[PDB]
Amino acid sequence: RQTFMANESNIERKWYVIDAEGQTLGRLSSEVASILRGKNKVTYTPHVDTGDYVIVINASKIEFTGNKETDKVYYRHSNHPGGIKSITAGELRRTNPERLIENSIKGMLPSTRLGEKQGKKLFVYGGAEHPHAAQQPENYELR
Amino acid sequence: MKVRPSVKPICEKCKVIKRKGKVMVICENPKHKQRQG
Amino acid sequence: MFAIIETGGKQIKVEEGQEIFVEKLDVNEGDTFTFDKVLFVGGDSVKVGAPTVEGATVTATVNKQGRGKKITVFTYKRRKNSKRKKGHRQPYTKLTIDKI
Amino acid sequence: FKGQKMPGRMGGNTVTVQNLEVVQVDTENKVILVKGNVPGPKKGLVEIRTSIK
Amino acid sequence: AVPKRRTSKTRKNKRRTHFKISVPGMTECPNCGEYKLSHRVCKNCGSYNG
RNA sequence: UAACUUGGGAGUCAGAACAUGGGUGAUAAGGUCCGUGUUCGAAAGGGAAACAGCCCAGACCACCAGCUAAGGUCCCAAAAUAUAUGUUAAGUGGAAAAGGAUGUGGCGUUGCCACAGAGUGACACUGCGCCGAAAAUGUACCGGGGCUAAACAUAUUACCGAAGCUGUGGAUUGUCCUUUG
RNA sequence: GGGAUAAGUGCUGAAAGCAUCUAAGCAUGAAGCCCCCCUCAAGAUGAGAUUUCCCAACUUCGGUUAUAAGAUCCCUCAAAG
């Protein structure tokens, strides 16, 4: 029974910054959902969280491939009879680019009490700057 | 304009072009104009 | 100085004075055993290779033969009058490593 | 279905009446006269703002 | 209508979270020296002393 | 490695789907009535999103051990953002016909070197797409995010993957005693 | 009233010397879509912002304590219920 598990006491976490310039929405989202989850460090510890905080920058520059800016609809419901709304992925990005990236990455993390706490490590901002200079966020390069 | 599953020419003048993923037939005589074959 | 032995159809990481539990051997309590199949000698000492290192035996003393904690094997199939109940205690041997 | 009509407590809620008109503003008493009626009971607070349309 | 399921000891003891009577809220009288009800007379000897 | 013979004790006489030969119905029905196989009934485990009957495989018990089957390898979710060569722009992939069409690859066969100069018109045979395509609480026919390759045809090389096989301990029951075992 | 569009109408323009609303590009176009108009809304656990008010005594706890700004028990009531 020689197996090592990691507890809150022995876990540390880093801060990274990813740039969305010239990146596909689904080719960037997949790689960020493996950092938040902590599948790059040797002590995986599925019961405990070991992931790292990431900061997206320039999230407007995100790019879609083929006729999607007018042929991809995001639907929602408000529980009232007949109330079902929709907005095209083009207009969403010219309106609220933080939401676009942030609702694609979260559809790749599990839906449990623990995947809800790993979705709070994602900070998204359209501008080339970010207000988190108080830490030491080092850059991470997507492969 | 006449919309029908089958669009074929009727005179020497009529011509068959394609706009926006649809097959139509422009032509001089406005009675010959048809779309979506 | 840790090594990787291969005793009971399994492998075990071993350190000096570590208490390790393995499957039932024939050696009597209070005797001294030895392991002839060592796979990896490393850590502080020189990294070595495989299938098996040349020589490199590991020695230990036998402390107790025993029988593990009891479990109960119950199963059934619903709407069909069929059940079954069994017990089990798996035997073991406890050793202490003293020379790698 | 959410949004059904059932019994419940009614009134008490903020109401607006648009496009009303002023008649005489009577300084030395500080009273205005507005052509029409105004929501609320007597001795109650009302607001008066220029129309948006 | 009748009840479809029984009610457990847990769901029964939550309902009575609020089924309790409050303190009568009394004060000492500056004659009797004995606790009396506020805005009433001292029963022990009647002196309202408004 | 089964067979037959005489004696003791029985249960069963409402069957179901799937594939393949046929009646009947309308070359309708999870329809029904026969022949021939298998699985369920009386069968757990892995895949098909969930799903008695479909593809793989038959659980004596214990283990933080190995190699495989169907099916798979961007994230949820274990293992290739692998390699080489091609196709498809519709989100086809991820429901459907008669018919219609200068969509685009191949392959040939040809008439004329003009058709309005470097080339031009007519035919088969085929790969993959387009239109035809309208329903009732809520997107709602990829399981979801998402994808222009993470889609499709062809060929190799690894890897994951079950209570299957193996490795080491234990338990009962039969056959042999290669060693009172 | 402004914004982006549906069926249609085009302008420029090739693949195909011409022709052609489309492939690159530039417009116009509905009681419908999104803001404008009217109420609710920070338990929006992502819990926001603004101006004001109060702020020492005991400790070997590294914390305790009542009291401050303030709000209630109780009582007289209606524009409320």
XYZ file of C-alpha atoms (C1' of nucleotides) in Angstrom:
645
model
C 0.000 0.000 0.000
C 2.930 2.361 -0.840
C 1.018 5.172 -2.663
C 1.404 8.937 -1.969
C -1.605 11.297 -1.721
C -1.367 15.105 -1.437
C -3.054 17.175 1.226
C -3.817 20.858 1.541
C -0.736 21.337 3.697
C 1.696 20.098 1.041
C 0.127 21.762 -2.013
C 1.383 24.998 -3.627
C 0.052 26.836 -6.689
C 1.556 29.065 -9.385
C 0.083 31.887 -11.458
C 0.248 31.977 -15.264
C -0.787 34.269 -18.094
C -2.115 32.981 -21.468
C -2.626 35.281 -24.523
C -5.704 34.604 -26.733
C -4.319 36.555 -29.753
C -4.682 34.510 -32.995
C -6.003 31.433 -31.103
C -8.953 29.093 -31.915
C -11.747 29.152 -29.263
C -11.660 25.331 -28.918
C -7.941 24.830 -29.381
C -7.130 27.258 -26.519
C -9.979 26.161 -24.205
C -8.806 22.552 -24.160
C -5.300 23.357 -22.991
C -6.430 25.748 -20.239
C -8.782 23.143 -18.803
C -5.836 20.819 -18.144
C -3.941 23.434 -16.160
C -6.803 24.405 -13.883
C -7.332 20.729 -13.188
C -3.694 19.987 -12.365
C -2.905 17.164 -14.772
C 0.614 18.435 -15.474
C 2.088 17.804 -12.023
C 3.116 14.423 -10.677
C 0.968 14.525 -7.536
C -2.446 14.411 -9.213
C -4.471 13.634 -6.064
C -7.971 13.428 -7.573
C -9.730 14.122 -4.245
C -7.755 17.325 -3.703
C -7.376 20.319 -5.992
C -3.831 21.032 -7.204
C -4.429 23.316 -10.170
C -2.888 26.655 -11.065
C -4.455 30.062 -11.586
C -4.512 31.303 -15.180
C -5.129 34.804 -16.535
C -6.447 35.167 -20.112
C -5.533 38.477 -21.864
C -6.709 39.976 -25.214
C -9.801 37.687 -25.203
C -11.464 39.701 -28.044
C -8.758 38.520 -30.540
C -10.155 34.920 -30.209
C -10.785 33.502 -33.736
C -13.384 30.968 -35.086
C -12.784 28.862 -38.256
C -15.284 28.853 -41.178
C -18.831 30.247 -41.244
C -19.360 30.480 -37.507
C -19.474 34.192 -36.810
C -23.031 33.976 -38.177
C -23.964 30.269 -37.913
C -23.456 29.407 -34.240
C -26.287 30.240 -31.863
C -26.047 30.323 -28.067
C -29.435 29.538 -26.511
C -30.788 30.060 -22.970
C -34.096 29.673 -21.106
C -35.616 31.753 -18.307
C -38.187 29.181 -17.042
C -41.110 31.239 -18.132
C -43.339 29.609 -20.771
C -42.174 30.646 -24.214
C -39.125 32.521 -23.004
C -36.153 31.117 -24.895
C -33.474 33.532 -26.039
C -30.537 33.379 -28.410
C -27.522 35.387 -29.507
C -25.091 34.778 -32.354
C -21.451 34.113 -31.513
C -20.389 37.085 -33.622
C -22.426 39.618 -31.707
C -21.482 38.090 -28.324
C -17.744 38.771 -29.003
C -18.362 42.423 -30.122
C -20.441 42.769 -26.900
C -19.064 40.693 -24.035
C -15.875 38.822 -24.918
C -15.148 37.809 -21.354
C -18.282 35.648 -21.318
C -17.480 33.816 -24.548
C -14.165 32.390 -23.425
C -15.412 31.718 -19.914
C -18.399 29.582 -20.937
C -16.356 27.393 -23.296
C -13.716 26.454 -20.738
C -16.316 25.647 -18.096
C -18.064 23.144 -20.337
C -14.916 21.056 -20.054
C -14.563 20.888 -16.282
C -16.622 18.337 -14.345
C -19.941 19.336 -12.820
C -19.415 18.617 -9.119
C -18.685 20.435 -5.863
C -15.030 20.321 -6.885
C -15.311 21.469 -10.489
C -17.212 24.508 -9.261
C -14.183 25.512 -7.195
C -11.765 25.042 -10.101
C -13.788 27.372 -12.295
C -13.064 30.269 -9.950
C -9.364 30.211 -10.870
C -10.071 31.575 -14.363
C -9.797 35.347 -14.847
C -10.716 36.759 -18.261
C -10.093 40.346 -19.463
C -10.305 41.777 -23.034
C -7.672 44.513 -22.517
C -3.907 43.901 -22.919
C -3.545 44.753 -19.207
C -4.643 43.005 -16.018
C -4.998 44.108 -12.386
C -3.155 41.151 -10.823
C 0.360 42.582 -10.725
C 0.535 41.896 -6.975
C 1.384 38.247 -7.582
C 4.228 37.211 -9.911
C 2.348 35.729 -12.868
C 4.853 34.165 -15.240
C 4.004 33.486 -18.880
C 2.934 30.075 -20.149
C 3.255 29.122 -23.794
C 0.620 26.962 -25.429
C 1.996 23.974 -27.268
C -40.792 34.763 -59.892
C -41.854 31.136 -59.673
C -40.456 28.789 -57.034
C -40.319 25.107 -57.940
C -38.173 22.018 -57.195
C -37.383 21.854 -60.906
C -35.826 24.792 -62.728
C -35.147 24.408 -66.423
C -34.732 26.897 -69.293
C -37.595 27.774 -71.673
C -36.083 29.906 -74.421
C -32.778 30.459 -76.185
C -32.187 33.606 -74.152
C -32.634 32.100 -70.663
C -29.457 31.368 -68.674
C -28.732 29.368 -65.498
C -26.585 30.967 -62.783
C -26.037 30.172 -59.099
C -26.360 32.688 -56.249
C -25.759 31.908 -52.570
C -26.057 28.137 -52.836
C -29.222 28.201 -54.943
C -29.831 27.590 -58.638
C -31.869 30.184 -60.507
C -32.528 31.203 -64.111
C -32.312 34.844 -65.077
C -33.752 35.748 -68.464
C -35.101 38.701 -70.379
C -38.817 37.828 -70.298
C -39.894 38.504 -66.687
C -42.233 35.514 -66.924
C -39.249 33.145 -67.230
C -37.557 34.107 -63.944
C -37.304 31.139 -61.582
C -35.370 30.068 -58.500
C -34.367 27.202 -56.226
C -33.998 24.101 -58.321
C 19.265 3.683 -0.297
C 16.078 2.063 -1.564
C 15.613 -0.999 -3.736
C 12.760 -2.673 -5.599
C 12.282 -6.324 -4.707
C 9.936 -8.817 -6.365
C 8.546 -11.295 -3.841
C 4.960 -12.468 -4.200
C 3.989 -11.804 -7.763
C 4.230 -8.130 -6.770
C 7.007 -5.564 -6.225
C 7.849 -3.706 -2.937
C 9.898 -0.503 -2.259
C 12.281 -1.335 0.669
C 14.332 0.781 3.104
C 16.526 -0.172 6.065
C 14.423 -1.066 9.147
C 11.119 -0.632 7.206
C 8.295 -3.048 8.234
C 6.826 -4.753 5.128
C 3.981 -7.250 4.759
C 4.098 -9.940 2.080
C 2.355 -13.200 1.197
C 2.768 -16.335 3.286
C 6.262 -17.835 3.070
C 7.413 -21.167 4.478
C 10.168 -19.710 6.654
C 9.609 -20.015 10.412
C 9.241 -17.082 12.798
C 12.519 -15.855 14.260
C 14.481 -16.997 11.209
C 16.243 -14.987 8.517
C 15.117 -14.847 4.893
C 16.705 -13.477 1.715
C 15.496 -12.014 -1.579
C 17.256 -13.124 -4.752
C 15.413 -10.939 -7.294
C 16.220 -7.241 -6.967
C 15.125 -5.007 -9.837
C 16.335 -1.470 -9.094
C 19.058 -0.198 -6.763
C 19.084 3.568 -6.622
C 18.498 6.799 -4.755
C 21.721 7.734 -3.021
C 23.492 4.710 -4.501
C 24.325 4.076 -8.144
C 21.426 3.853 -10.575
C 21.390 0.368 -12.105
C 19.465 -1.569 -14.722
C 17.366 -4.629 -15.567
C 15.900 -7.298 -16.054
C 17.772 -8.092 -12.847
C 20.877 -6.714 -11.149
C 23.821 -9.117 -10.756
C 24.088 -10.458 -7.232
C 22.605 -7.789 -4.968
C 20.609 -9.892 -2.490
C 18.450 -8.307 0.216
C 18.252 -9.798 3.711
C 15.508 -9.703 6.350
C 14.326 -11.330 9.593
C 10.911 -12.944 10.040
C 8.822 -11.450 12.839
C 5.410 -13.152 12.718
C 3.141 -15.329 10.626
C -0.510 -14.440 10.833
C -3.934 -14.049 9.271
C -5.331 -10.758 8.012
C -8.516 -8.971 8.956
C -11.702 -10.906 8.262
C -14.042 -9.955 5.435
C -17.408 -11.340 4.365
C -18.342 -12.239 0.808
C -22.105 -11.864 0.395
C -24.005 -11.742 -2.911
C -27.559 -12.256 -4.132
C -29.935 -12.013 -7.095
C -33.243 -10.235 -6.612
C -36.656 -11.836 -7.183
C -34.856 -15.202 -7.346
C -34.411 -17.093 -4.102
C -30.623 -17.238 -4.328
C -28.076 -15.980 -1.787
C -24.623 -17.041 -0.621
C -22.344 -16.187 2.302
C -18.634 -16.858 2.773
C -15.797 -15.722 5.012
C -12.112 -15.225 4.331
C -8.838 -14.481 6.124
C -5.736 -14.080 4.028
C -2.454 -15.118 5.683
C 0.641 -12.948 5.696
C 4.274 -12.679 6.799
C 5.888 -9.618 8.373
C 9.579 -8.893 7.876
C 12.052 -6.127 8.625
C 14.733 -5.091 6.149
C 18.276 -4.825 7.474
C 20.745 -4.839 4.561
C 20.198 -3.553 1.030
C -46.264 27.263 -15.264
C -44.269 30.016 -13.594
C -46.152 33.285 -13.959
C -49.716 32.219 -13.167
C -52.503 34.377 -11.749
C -53.475 33.578 -8.162
C -54.643 35.461 -5.053
C -52.147 37.635 -3.236
C -51.524 41.038 -1.746
C -52.176 43.869 -4.203
C -51.205 47.529 -4.261
C -48.277 49.290 -2.678
C -46.161 49.316 -5.791
C -44.556 52.214 -7.631
C -46.667 53.585 -10.497
C -45.995 56.266 -13.096
C -48.464 58.404 -15.035
C -46.940 60.078 -18.075
C -47.792 63.230 -20.026
C -49.719 65.131 -17.342
C -49.974 68.935 -17.568
C -49.470 71.930 -15.266
C -52.144 74.594 -14.801
C -51.199 77.288 -12.295
C -48.081 77.405 -10.138
C -49.005 79.467 -7.110
C -46.063 80.998 -5.327
C -46.639 82.613 -1.903
C -48.170 79.197 -1.041
C -45.848 76.855 -2.922
C -48.632 74.737 -4.396
C -48.845 73.399 -7.940
C -52.041 72.401 -9.740
C -51.714 69.387 -12.034
C -54.420 68.531 -14.560
C -55.491 64.991 -13.689
C -54.968 62.592 -10.816
C -51.829 61.344 -9.093
C -51.118 57.901 -7.573
C -51.049 57.340 -3.852
C -53.188 58.317 -0.893
C -53.361 61.759 0.699
C -50.405 63.044 2.698
C -48.105 60.945 0.564
C -44.910 61.664 -1.290
C -45.035 62.274 -5.036
C -42.303 63.126 -7.524
C -42.610 65.477 -10.488
C -40.280 65.316 -13.478
C -40.234 66.648 -17.028
C -41.466 64.147 -19.620
C -39.070 61.904 -21.525
C -41.154 61.961 -24.707
C -56.474 14.773 0.678
C -54.513 12.166 2.608
C -50.758 11.922 3.267
C -48.888 9.795 0.768
C -45.820 9.062 2.906
C -45.107 8.936 6.603
C -43.185 11.806 8.188
C -39.785 11.099 9.703
C -38.472 12.253 13.059
C -36.193 14.682 11.235
C -38.781 16.504 9.137
C -41.103 16.726 12.142
C -38.481 18.393 14.343
C -37.641 21.070 11.772
C -41.225 22.308 11.512
C -41.235 23.109 15.225
C -38.190 25.353 14.892
C -40.579 28.262 15.377
C -43.170 26.786 17.767
C -42.094 28.452 20.995
C -43.443 31.096 23.349
C -41.491 34.244 24.148
C -40.340 35.883 27.375
C -43.093 37.914 29.097
C -40.674 40.845 29.270
C -41.066 42.106 32.819
C -39.404 44.674 35.067
C -38.958 45.208 38.791
C -41.369 47.575 40.520
C -39.962 50.513 42.492
C -42.107 49.740 45.452
C -42.904 46.069 45.670
C -39.368 45.162 44.636
C -40.901 42.188 42.863
C -41.043 41.513 39.139
C -44.198 42.912 37.556
C -45.610 43.232 34.069
C -44.843 46.459 32.242
C -47.677 48.991 32.034
C -49.758 47.009 34.530
C -50.277 47.201 38.258
C -48.242 45.326 40.827
C -50.400 42.393 41.823
C -48.614 41.939 45.123
C -49.785 45.394 46.175
C -51.384 47.707 43.649
C -49.390 50.842 43.006
C -49.152 52.007 39.384
C -47.444 55.301 40.242
C -47.760 56.707 36.740
C -15.363 -38.683 -24.064
C -19.278 -40.100 -24.357
C -23.289 -43.946 -25.221
C -27.262 -47.601 -24.415
C -30.435 -50.957 -20.525
C -33.361 -51.819 -16.279
C -35.291 -49.506 -11.601
C -36.330 -44.501 -7.718
C -37.918 -38.964 -7.890
C -39.228 -34.932 -10.785
C -40.365 -30.189 -13.282
C -42.310 -28.420 -18.168
C -47.435 -28.070 -21.925
C -48.468 -18.548 -21.640
C -42.187 -18.265 -24.446
C -39.342 -13.274 -26.342
C -36.087 -10.524 -29.536
C -31.978 -10.551 -33.396
C -30.028 -12.741 -38.191
C -31.383 -15.941 -42.535
C -35.260 -19.167 -45.906
C -41.088 -18.749 -46.742
C -46.693 -18.239 -46.034
C -50.568 -14.236 -44.534
C -51.083 -8.578 -44.496
C -50.155 -3.605 -48.203
C -42.457 -6.548 -51.138
C -47.299 -2.130 -43.368
C -46.544 -3.094 -37.793
C -41.704 -4.175 -31.150
C -48.055 -7.805 -36.152
C -48.587 -13.143 -36.828
C -47.590 -18.749 -38.317
C -43.962 -22.397 -39.621
C -38.279 -24.146 -40.902
C -32.846 -23.178 -39.224
C -28.932 -20.980 -35.697
C -27.643 -18.021 -31.269
C -28.439 -14.979 -26.868
C -32.336 -13.950 -22.861
C -35.585 -16.990 -19.740
C -31.827 -19.369 -15.587
C -25.862 -14.840 -16.815
C -22.850 -11.163 -13.469
C -18.439 -8.116 -16.030
C -16.529 -4.487 -20.665
C -18.555 -1.402 -25.122
C -23.413 0.685 -27.845
C -24.668 8.244 -23.828
C -29.010 5.751 -20.661
C -31.199 0.523 -22.986
C -33.594 -8.428 -20.529
C -32.669 -10.376 -26.413
C -27.476 -6.319 -30.329
C -20.864 -6.731 -30.719
C -16.920 -9.131 -26.960
C -16.810 -12.728 -22.903
C -19.062 -17.593 -19.013
C -17.704 -14.732 -11.737
C -14.559 -20.890 -6.294
C -12.190 -16.728 -2.637
C -8.040 -12.780 -1.458
C -4.268 -8.530 -4.120
C -2.814 -0.038 -4.612
C 0.354 -6.944 -10.101
C 1.106 -8.208 -15.448
C -0.554 -9.344 -21.330
C -5.020 -8.965 -24.447
C -10.800 -8.859 -26.689
C -15.056 -5.727 -28.683
C -14.466 -0.474 -28.571
C -11.095 3.346 -28.599
C -6.703 7.927 -27.737
C -8.431 17.318 -28.116
C -11.187 18.275 -22.770
C -15.345 15.963 -19.399
C -12.765 10.411 -19.148
C -7.677 5.946 -18.846
C -4.296 5.759 -23.843
C -1.378 9.548 -30.727
C -3.321 17.300 -30.877
C 1.208 10.021 -34.266
C 3.069 9.107 -39.557
C 2.512 8.916 -45.063
C -0.966 10.084 -49.395
C -5.571 11.887 -51.004
C -10.802 13.929 -50.932
C -15.060 17.305 -48.810
C -16.858 24.124 -47.477
C -21.883 21.612 -46.275
C -21.123 21.976 -39.740
C -21.760 17.352 -44.894
C -20.097 14.445 -40.992
C -24.433 14.409 -36.824
C -32.216 10.998 -40.358
C -35.475 10.319 -46.001
C -37.256 9.694 -52.559
C -38.929 10.898 -57.805
C -36.745 14.815 -60.279
C -33.409 19.406 -61.144
C -28.463 21.702 -61.689
C -21.520 25.567 -65.591
C -20.266 22.435 -57.373
C -15.630 19.789 -57.485
C -12.098 15.382 -58.202
C -10.877 11.512 -61.376
C -10.595 8.520 -65.710
C -11.269 7.775 -70.971
C -13.288 8.965 -75.764
C -13.170 12.814 -79.402
C -14.568 17.399 -83.202
C -11.739 21.951 -84.223
C -6.910 24.118 -83.545
C -10.007 28.290 -83.741
C -14.075 29.837 -79.127
C -14.108 35.642 -79.774
C -5.466 33.473 -79.286
C -3.324 29.155 -76.724
C -5.970 25.944 -76.792
C -11.703 24.820 -77.741
C -16.642 22.690 -77.964
C -19.743 16.915 -77.378
C -20.161 12.464 -74.960
C -19.812 7.708 -71.246
C -18.047 5.929 -66.819
C -17.261 7.138 -61.430
C -15.547 9.490 -55.903
C -17.378 13.152 -52.424
C -21.037 17.256 -51.878
C -25.862 21.033 -53.096
C -31.586 21.845 -53.774
C -36.060 19.045 -53.211
C -36.576 19.189 -46.652
C -42.927 22.114 -42.804
C -45.101 20.706 -35.686
C -46.773 21.415 -31.431
C -43.541 22.795 -22.694
C -37.157 24.081 -23.974
C -31.788 24.407 -27.888
C -33.726 18.925 -28.733
C -31.314 13.594 -34.631
C -22.775 14.385 -32.548
C -24.241 12.320 -24.972
C -22.077 17.893 -23.835
C -18.089 21.804 -24.654
C -16.067 22.150 -29.155
C -13.928 20.797 -34.093
C -12.307 22.797 -41.115
C -9.587 18.346 -39.103
C -10.855 16.344 -33.263
C -14.727 14.623 -40.654
C -14.162 10.717 -44.689
C -11.341 6.656 -47.886
C -6.021 3.639 -47.764
C -1.728 1.758 -45.440
C 1.657 0.909 -41.116
C 3.439 1.723 -36.223
C 2.732 2.094 -30.875
C -0.670 2.810 -26.415
C -5.233 2.258 -23.280
C -8.961 -1.533 -22.362
C -13.096 -7.013 -18.749
C -14.702 -10.684 -12.765
C -11.280 -13.259 -20.118
C -5.701 -15.716 -19.753
C -1.355 -15.434 -16.649
C 1.644 -14.473 -11.741
C 1.807 -15.612 -6.333
C -1.262 -17.456 -1.556
C -5.840 -20.328 0.223
C -10.226 -23.580 -0.001
C -13.335 -27.830 -1.143
C -14.326 -32.152 -4.842
C -12.839 -36.262 -8.505
C -8.731 -38.738 -11.383
C -3.649 -40.558 -11.040
C -0.313 -42.936 -5.450
C 5.902 -39.862 -11.107
C 7.851 -37.937 -3.896
C 3.205 -41.922 3.359
C 2.536 -37.373 -0.552
C -36.461 57.038 -33.029
C -30.990 54.678 -33.994
C -28.293 49.457 -34.583
C -27.902 44.704 -37.155
C -31.043 41.515 -40.752
C -35.267 38.237 -43.676
C -37.644 37.781 -48.941
C -36.459 41.259 -52.675
C -33.558 45.632 -55.417
C -28.740 46.905 -56.680
C -23.589 49.172 -57.536
C -18.356 47.360 -58.694
C -16.280 42.797 -60.270
C -13.767 38.340 -61.948
C -13.391 32.469 -62.383
C -15.248 31.951 -68.344
C -11.753 38.247 -73.912
C -18.049 39.123 -73.228
C -22.279 38.361 -69.610
C -23.407 38.113 -64.370
C -26.015 41.025 -57.118
C -20.877 37.113 -55.045
C -16.499 34.231 -54.766
C -12.876 39.208 -52.535
C -15.311 44.201 -51.612
C -19.418 48.345 -50.912
C -24.701 49.541 -50.074
C -30.217 49.522 -49.291
C -34.283 46.785 -47.278
C -40.252 44.669 -42.453
C -45.939 45.247 -37.276
C -40.590 40.616 -36.622
C -34.688 40.447 -33.635
C -31.372 43.966 -30.091
C -31.335 48.784 -27.405
C -34.943 52.864 -26.578
C -40.544 53.111 -22.991
C -42.495 51.033 -17.914
C -41.922 47.936 -12.847
C -38.751 44.247 -10.085
C -33.678 43.240 -9.141
C -26.213 42.624 -5.220
C -28.203 35.306 -1.695
C -25.331 38.671 -8.898
C -21.829 33.330 -2.686
C -18.852 36.943 -8.976
C -22.497 38.944 -2.469
C -20.588 46.002 -6.289
C -20.125 51.664 -5.499
C -21.114 56.584 -2.658
C -21.568 60.286 1.617
C -21.789 60.182 6.981
C -21.613 58.002 12.556
C -19.000 55.334 16.671
C -13.417 53.512 18.122
C -10.544 51.521 25.429
C -10.431 49.215 29.602
C -8.371 44.213 31.599
C -5.033 40.869 30.632
C 0.724 36.258 29.721
C -4.320 34.231 25.233
C -1.738 35.124 21.292
C -7.966 36.871 24.271
C -11.861 38.223 27.163
C -15.734 42.223 28.995
C -19.883 45.073 29.143
C -20.932 49.512 26.870
C -20.683 53.359 22.412
C -23.209 54.898 17.069
C -27.735 52.129 16.599
C -31.914 48.782 16.784
C -35.760 46.236 19.932
C -39.190 44.305 24.296
C -43.483 47.233 26.170
C -47.426 51.231 25.072
C -50.829 55.199 21.958
C -52.180 54.461 16.549
C -53.347 54.402 10.542
C -52.192 56.634 4.883
C -50.815 49.986 6.481
C -52.793 45.242 7.458
